[model samples]
Target chain A: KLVRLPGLIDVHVHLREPGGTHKEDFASGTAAALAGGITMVCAMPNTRPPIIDAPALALAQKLAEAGARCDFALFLGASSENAGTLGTVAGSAAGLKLYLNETFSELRLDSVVQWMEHFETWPSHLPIVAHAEQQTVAAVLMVAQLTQRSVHICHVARKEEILLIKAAKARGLPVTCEVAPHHLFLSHDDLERLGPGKGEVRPELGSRQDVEALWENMAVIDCFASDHAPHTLEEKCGSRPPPGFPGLETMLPLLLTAVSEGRLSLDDLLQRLHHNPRRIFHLPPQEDTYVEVDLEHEWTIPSHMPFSKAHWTPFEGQKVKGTVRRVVLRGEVAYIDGQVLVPPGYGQDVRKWPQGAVPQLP
Target chain B: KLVRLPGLIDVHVHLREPGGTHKEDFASGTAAALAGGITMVCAMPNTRPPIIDAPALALAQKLAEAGARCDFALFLGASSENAGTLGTVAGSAAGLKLYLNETFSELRLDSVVQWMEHFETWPSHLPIVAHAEQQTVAAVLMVAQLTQRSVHICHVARKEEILLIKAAKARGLPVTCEVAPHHLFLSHDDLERLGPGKGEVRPELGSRQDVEALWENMAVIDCFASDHAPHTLEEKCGSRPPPGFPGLETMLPLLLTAVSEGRLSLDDLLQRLHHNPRRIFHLPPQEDTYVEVDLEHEWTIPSHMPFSKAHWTPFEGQKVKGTVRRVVLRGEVAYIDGQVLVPPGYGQDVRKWPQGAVPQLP
Candidate 1:
């Protein structure tokens, strides 16, 4: 019943450090990732002082190196002010993260001029990750087409978006997209149960039809990201709750449940969670990194998540068929049986790892 | 200078006869069409008791024959109940109308099974006119692809939608779409002035960027429709206000203004409003129908409309260039200087006209 697979890589997560660390810091965030069988996570750049330039990125990197429990990479946030300068630190970051639409953060870029600047200035080999939804998806793709650069769309939730991406890829455009587990597993109908505040997430929960369309066009999707933005339960219950969901710990379980139900194949799951993430982000190999899961295990998601400081989950009480039993990070045991075995600073930056040090996986 | 052009055709209008005639009826609705330089209008089927079955179609045809003041054709509503039998009256209707998304009417079909039934059963030569928005647009196109039928999407409002249709056509999928003037001219920013009730519309108003994208991708557009779903001002301001706007009287003037501003070409306007509509709907030629417009005329839109019983306009107080001066239908002057010279029953049904009785226009 036990299965060993390559440690998963989540290309999107918001470890709210140096700003909103009360919700989730690198320490708790990476611990949550390890427990979920993820050995590496590419953290988003929407913190208090966003990681838009070298100084901000260095600050974020310093924190990640000091506090993270698993392999990590920091995304340099795209901004009008930093679009021309982002390339200076491209070697130290995962990729450029462009906020082309509304998110919980104020990092959104509204003009095509801004998008174009980022698309042109960012290294062509490294992908530009965009928080684009609906029409913005088309706009960003057009910019990518104009610049002849590779772009990665984040948390694509709507049917139109996925279909547009499908057409772009069919036409040989260098475009790829990631779907958030929240978007795939939940819909607006679930809002009644979660209530207004807890139900909130950017590229908001689409209709049942949208969710079905995402599944129908699954072949067009390249990566599965949690968009792991965590907010405290008290903050979510407040009058003016910020939008986001704490998803690091629930994504793998949910995908595994989907696999068990035949909604997706195991190979497709691995490709989106591991192979595609690695290739798209140009992540270095983690030697001997793997995860052990009990495919036959059944458990209800706990109301209070174990490692994420966010303290709550939308998947609370949902029964899942698979459970992460142990996660091995670069030949060392990082998580096993409800415990995080690795200490802070033990995790190395994937971006800093020497290329070709370890043989790439076939 | 006065310019003479072929009488414009509006492929989408909701004349609320046999159901909610207080808002509008065949007589008043046709008068408004003529006033706006539209000599022929294709009425939507989401009336009181929707025109789904042959009996409903006969009743609607009878109403149009007795009360319509301009040339007209009725669309047959697609329902699970009438998918198989719709072809019996296909010869009489302009085309089949499928509501694949939310609208003011109860005619929407949510399941692909129902959509497939209609696509498989409806005649292929006549395009299936669909009130599909966003993801539903993709769903309908997929069904059309599967069924090998031509589909003309109605009131395409979002950037993603028009782009998807563009891609479908590029792939030779027999898909075409019409953009509503409201969607192209206004956006959610207008909602502040329109208020929540009056601004209410299906597929709702998209962002300012959405409006820009529609214009940006205008080359992919096949037709321009008013989607003139009229509701009284009082009803619009009520607690449970219905979704729609009285657009028949403003569509042409607005497009004409766009032409004067060089935002559009006169040739493109003619193609969408006249040539493409005729070809897509398989509408017969009008022997000597033409409209006279003074392109230099400039005036502010009146708060109270001249013809539509809805008595209000979303374009109220907006200054626009160009004015409809005269409309000649079937070699007879039918409208001039805000007066409708044609009486009820004078407008002939385009479908019943004998094929080849008049030479097709080059």
Candidate 2:
């Protein structure tokens, strides 16, 4: 008999829609996620036509409604240029994403305080995600303390960064954080096997010691999200290798392997994979959203055996001990044993924050 | 009594003369080399006015003869345009540098065969060095078999690359290779501590597995060059981080600590730093080139201590077991107890191959 669990929710993912479809799109990313037992994901807005304005967010909603295989919430990118876009529509976005640093867009804010100011424009009940790393996490916490806005840190990597998050959580600053499986399982120790691909991820991999530290502080980590950034082989193998590698399919298996190896307890795994994400994102329990996994199954993650248009994974060749046997999405039998059963556009838009939702900050 | 070693020969170093002297000059670079216990170094040609032709090589030779604090040889940059420069002067260079893939010159050869053809243009007895990594090493080895040219792989990283080198050596191809101390000591795991400076090295840091593999295949490695690339704090902490960290000064001490830790033996260390470089480069031993070290000495590698103009090291804060107490360059006590005794021009031009030297190829 297979073990049954609530469907996993990834609060961070890059579907690469509205641009760079060759790498990944809504249909493929969510389809792969369902196969990996993830039924819901929050899509980031750092694409060609980013969801930084009312029209863009609306278009993203329409596109996901038309082609997505699993439920998704689109984040409205927060930039000085799109400073007026936040809360423009009643349910225009799931939350706001502040790129306090990094590029390919104008969403990069000059200061942590500036990003927090943008966070103020959103409904306080909604999540305000920040691309915080290193000392920047502390800065975000500082601004959040001053402005009293709830913030979600995207892809925390270092031990020091996690310490800051834990401190904020203890202070009851309404701060939450996500960690990627790649950060937990792989480290600079794996760079030889991955090479430049190791660097292809945002914020990059930490040391083996830091990776262990991540596991040690797991109770403080609010959720586990893939931060599943995908780039095509042509992009990865080219002159300027972009940051990010595909992760949707491997996140569950990799973490499941960790649980089997005693690195993570099954209870903690469920907490990170499902419960915390649901509570933090305000997604209530679904009637039939669940998945069954064969805990004894062991297999190697082969390259290009994913629905991601990128068709490659940094977890390539990694062995794991559990397999997703079946998935139930919204009371429908969605996926079974590596096969996706849902048709295109079967996924519903996950806009949990209602229009004109008032600020709930302290 | 102090432990004595042949003045170390660093076959790889970048003295950014004629292009970016603010980072390093011949005077500062050679002085730094001596301070680090290296009495001789072969400078790379990836500079502004890259030493690709007879004129550029002549200019480099003149500059080194004028201001170098230790004996020196410069590699003539091999580019498609400078293919004809080989054999122009009998002993014009230490070897030809083929950037099979990298920046800083027109020498970026495209295909493996194209680069091998360029390698064939060099004197068969002298080394046709390659910046080959991963599959490129196998490609270089393949072309080397067809072209019958002696090839030296530079700053090799990755187990696959090392395996390729070991197999080539087993086949008795005139194949030689070098490994930087940083590659052996540091990795992406160390990046959290070192930051961008870690990525600021050529071939970059590999996985812990690759580092161990590099250690295991020490027998196949012929030389221990610093690949001592130097850049200013202004450059490294700037808009663009260049590759290749400064290794000249820290190389010996770092390796000596490895010996104390039982990771490497002193005998193998001597072969890599002294004998192999001498036999392969065809340079006869010097009468006064030697360094005395107190192997029992324990010290932390201080930042900005290297003689290279870069004045920084990725190995900063590392505890080392051995210390270079004194250095004698070409019969002159050029450096003693962390102080340079020689003035500019103390180093004689160390061009081993003179014009019209007969090709000693088998």
Which one wins on DockQ?
A: 1
Candidate 2 residue-wise lDDT, B1-362, digit = tens = 69988878888988988687998998998888888888888898888788888788778888888888988778887776766556766355777788866665476764343464575677677767888765456556545654656778898877766765675566567788988888798887888888874466768788898898888888877788888888887778777777768777888889889888988788889999988987777655666678998899999988878467786778888889998999987777899887898998877656653522335645
Please state the interface RMSD for every predicted structure, separated by commas: 9.0, 23.7
State in Å the error of residue A163, model 2: 58
| Angstrom error at residue B103, model 2 | 1.5
**Model 2 local distance difference test score:** 0.78
Docking class of 2: incorrect
Candidate 1 positional error at B286, Å:
0.7
lDDT of 2 by residue, A117-231 (tens): 5655666677778886654565555456445567788888887677656755655667788899889988887788887844577788998877888888988888999988888
Candidate 1 lDDT over B47-153, as tens digits, reads: 98888888888999999999998999998888757777875678778888888766444576645657767887876666588877654665565556546567888
Docking class of 1: incorrect
| Proportion of native contacts present in model 1 | 0.00
